[PDB]
Amino acid sequence: ELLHAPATVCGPKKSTNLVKNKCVNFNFNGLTGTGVLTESNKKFLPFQQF
Amino acid sequence: LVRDLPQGFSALEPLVDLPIGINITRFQTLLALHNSSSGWTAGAAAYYVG
């Protein structure tokens, strides 16, 4: 059942590899889009994702 | 050393997720020192609530 509460049960996520320096699509935990992924010289705080 | 809250700035980092679907109406907290000599008692400290 699902009425109001946030999902507590879900299936497995069929993830794959990661490709750098190429024009690819992407999906990071639901964050979809397209472009080229490159090594960053900047940092994120330990709890920040995007 | 200061007699009150510091004259500065600090940002607060996230700690938990806890997807809890509860309708909260009120709040009560507690901690105090209780000896075994004169029965239940209390300490001498204050906390801030905003």
Side-chain angles (χ1 to χ4, degrees), chain A residues 26-33 37 40 42-50:
Chain A
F26 58 81
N27 182 329
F28 294 94
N29 298 332
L31 180 66
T32 61
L37 309 177
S40 181
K42 302 292 184 181
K43 304 295 184 185
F44 286 14
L45 298 175
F47 57 89
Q48 296 179 313
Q49 183 58 37
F50 301 136

Side-chain angles (χ1 to χ4, degrees), chain B residues 3-32:
Chain B
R3 293 176 66 196
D4 205 352
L5 291 169
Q7 300 302 289
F9 176 88
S10 179
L12 310 176
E13 297 177 13
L15 271 62
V16 301
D17 53 344
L18 297 173
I20 299 169
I22 293 172
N23 184 14
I24 297 169
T25 62
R26 287 190 67 172
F27 175 96
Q28 184 176 9
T29 188
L30 172 67
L31 184 137

